[model samples]
Target: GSGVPAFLAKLWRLVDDADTNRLICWTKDGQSFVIQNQAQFAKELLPLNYKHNNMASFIRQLNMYGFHKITSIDNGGLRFDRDEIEFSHPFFKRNSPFLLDQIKRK
Candidate 1:
């Protein structure tokens, strides 16, 4: 069960244990995270106003960024390890402003 990277394994737990109410809570108005179907999941997470025509590439991007694919026990839909989405380490503070912003936005 813990075959993935350490950070990813920890993140998998966070998402797995995340209360639905808390997961849906968003800091930005109109922004929400819902366990949608695989297609919708990919669609909604894309940058604002950006549309992805290919799911293969969309999934590739997620993998490229260190996200590990998972299947949700509750909904049985595709879920990605969200450590990069909602958490950050000190190492990335200065090296990755984008990641910092992502974590801050949550």
Candidate 2:
């Protein structure tokens, strides 16, 4: 109960508390950075495809934003606070436009 399972339990709690209004930035630089405000980055720079099924979605969205390097989670600039988890999109590159467009409709 103190390894992967425990880690996931904590991660789920973070996601459950995440503020949807806050911006989660996915960069073309293969980096996933969380932004409190969307204006900090260009809206056009946002991921345009993919959907969030789980952790995989995080990775897919990052590639959609235009990044290629698959950096390890521990090595990335995106770090998780005690109750927070951050990650890059997973897609290959620019494949999320359709997905992003759908999000805009909501």
Candidate 3:
């Protein structure tokens, strides 16, 4: 068996394969928020007719991967600079910043 669960692994793959134009993240009042293309996320990753219970399970998978939810912020319908992507995982003691420019976005 793989080290990570299949569900989490699939989510990670979706994230990795997602288009940059479809990804957005921001920080406000020391909290971070991220939103992928909802339509595509649902169509590609989530089960058909996914409901609140499925969303809760997805959130739990995110937590297991060390993703912390932050308060949603208003970007005024603007996209975040790709350089602002940051990540923190249980394997790391603290969060690390990565310039999205340096990483290829699918």
Candidate 4:
């Protein structure tokens, strides 16, 4: 395979492909991202990108990839969700897919 991290590629695709506000989507500024529904995201979304439907394991991977979770209070009303769980990383951005190549797995 390529030297690229497999999860990163799938993460990008999860963000890059598809939406209506979406089960998962980028934040307004595109510096971070939010998942609107963990149950649906785990059951519906994660399966498309990963081997199993497990949001905990998904977040675990995000943590290992250096993504920091941003809570609702922290967002300061930037955006809201039914069950928003946001995460951020330095090199991850919408429309900046190439930067993901710079992200290394921990």
Among these predicted structures, which one has the highest TM-score? 4
TM-score of each: 0.29, 0.21, 0.35, 0.71
- Give candidate 1 regions above 4 Å deviation: 1-34, 42-48, 72-106
lDDT of 1 by residue, 1-106 (tens): 3234444343333333544323322223322223324454444444342454555675555455544333333454556544323322332322232443333212
| Cα RMSD for candidates in order | 13.3, 15.6, 10.7, 3.9
**What digit string (tens of lDDT, one per residue) describes model 3 on residues 5-72?**
44434434444443432553332332343554444434434654243334446555655545644333
Question: Which lDDT value does model 4 have at 15?
Answer: 77
lDDT of 4 by residue, 1-106 (tens): 2465777767666676565247778788666787777776677766655668767887777677677776736445544545768777777765664776677766
lDDT of 1 at 79: 63
Residues 46-65, candidate 2, lDDT per residue (tens digit)? Answer: 23322223344444654564
Ranking of all candidate structures by their lDDT, best first: 4, 3, 1, 2
Record all residue pairs in model 1 with backbone atoms less than 3 Å apart, i.e. clashing.
none
Error of 1 at 22 (Å): 13
